[PDB]
Amino acid sequence: GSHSMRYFFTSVSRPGRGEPRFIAVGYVDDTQFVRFDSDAASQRMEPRAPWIEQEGPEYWDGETRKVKAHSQTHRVDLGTLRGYYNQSEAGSHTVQRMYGCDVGSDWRFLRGYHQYAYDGKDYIALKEDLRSWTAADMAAQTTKHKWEAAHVAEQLRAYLEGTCVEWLRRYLENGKETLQRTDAPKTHMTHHAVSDHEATLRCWALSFYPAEITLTWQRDGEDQTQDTELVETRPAGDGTFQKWAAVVVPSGQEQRYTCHVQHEGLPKPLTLRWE
Amino acid sequence: MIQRTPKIQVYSRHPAENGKSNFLNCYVSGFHPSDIEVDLLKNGERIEKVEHSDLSFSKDWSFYLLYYTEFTPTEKDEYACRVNHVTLSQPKIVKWDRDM
Amino acid sequence: ILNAMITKI
Ligand code: NA
C-alpha cells in the first residue's frame, strides 16, 4: 500500500540542570530506523533497523551533522518561545517537531507535512499546498512572518517533494524484506464471566503489520461504539503489533455479538462469531 | 499547561506458557509532558535489566514508550508495571493478567 | 535522510 517517512523531534527545557533534552527518531511507516539522543554518550545518529546499517560513513557523518543542527535550532527555539509567551526560566517546556512525506502504492508523492508544537498543542504547520502556513495563535504569527520573509516554505517543499521521497524509495527497496511486507492479524475472541449474569467479550488481533487496523463490535449488526473498550495499538517488540476491543454483555446474549477486523493483510474483512 | 495521563498496558509478546522464555512489555502511550518513570516489577521488586524504546509521539503530540525485558513465566511469579507521571497523584501499578 | 535547513522559529 502507501508508505511514509517521518522524523520526530522532542525538545525539553531542564531549568537549572543545564542543556535541554533533544531526541530525534526517524521512521519508515511503523518501523524506526534512526535515533539521536542528546543524553547518550555517542553523540551520533545511530541505526535502529538492520537495513539502514549498510549506509556508509558519509551517511552517518552527514546525518549526525544535520541532527546536531536540528538540536542547535531547537536549543535556541526554547529561549525564543519563552520570549514570545513571556514565560519565566522556572518551568520546563516542550517543543515537538514532525516532518515527512507520504507516497502511494505506486510510490509517487502523495503529500508532505511539517508540524511544530509547543507544550503539547499546535504551534505552526505547513499547509498541504506546501506554500503557506497555519499559525495557531498570535505568537506563531510572529514565526509565520519571519518564515515567509525567509522563504522557509520554498526550501521545505523542495525537500518534501524531492529528497524526502527519493530516500523513502531507497529505504523501501533496501529494506523491502521488512518494509514491503504485510502480516495479517491472527484473530480470536475470549470469553470470561464477570458475574453470574455478565461476561467480557474481548476481540483480539495479534502479530500484524503494519499497525493500521480496525476492530469493531456489533450487536445484531449494530455498531456498539459507545460500549466498546478499545485499547491503543501496541508493539509486540518483534516488529508486529497487537490490539483488542472489549464489550461487557449479559450472559446468554453472546450470539448477538460479532467482532469485525479490517487490515490490509486480510483478503477480506473478518467476522468472528460466538456460534 | 497541557497534561495527558499515560495509558498503561502490561502484556507478553507471545502467549504465556509456564517455563517458556518470553518477553514482558509495558507500553505507555498518550501522555504529556514527556517526563515519566516506568518500572517492571517481579513479585513487587524492580526488575534490573529493562530496556526501553526511543521517545516518540503520535499525531495528537502525546508521547509513547515501550519498556521490555526477557522473562520466563511461572505459576507463582507475579509481574506488574509501575508508572509515575505528573498526572498521577500516586504511582500506578498495573498487574500482568495472562488470561485476557 | 534529514532536511539540511532548519530555520529558527
Ligand atoms: Na506523580
Author numbering:
A (entry chain A): 1 to 275
B (entry chain B): 1 to 100
C (entry chain C): 1 to 9
Study authors write:
We developed a rapid procedure for accurately modeling large numbers of peptides bound to the common class I MHC protein HLA-A*0201 (HLA-A2), which was applied to a curated dataset incorporating thousands of immunogenic, non-immunogenic, and non-HLA-A2 binding peptides. Our hypothesis was predicated on the notion that immunogenicity is influenced by both peptide binding to the MHC protein as well as TCR binding to the peptide/MHC complex.
The utility of these models is found when comparing results for mutant peptides and their wild-type counterparts, as the models can indicate the types of structural alterations that impact TCR recognition of a mutated vs. wild-type peptide/MHC complex.
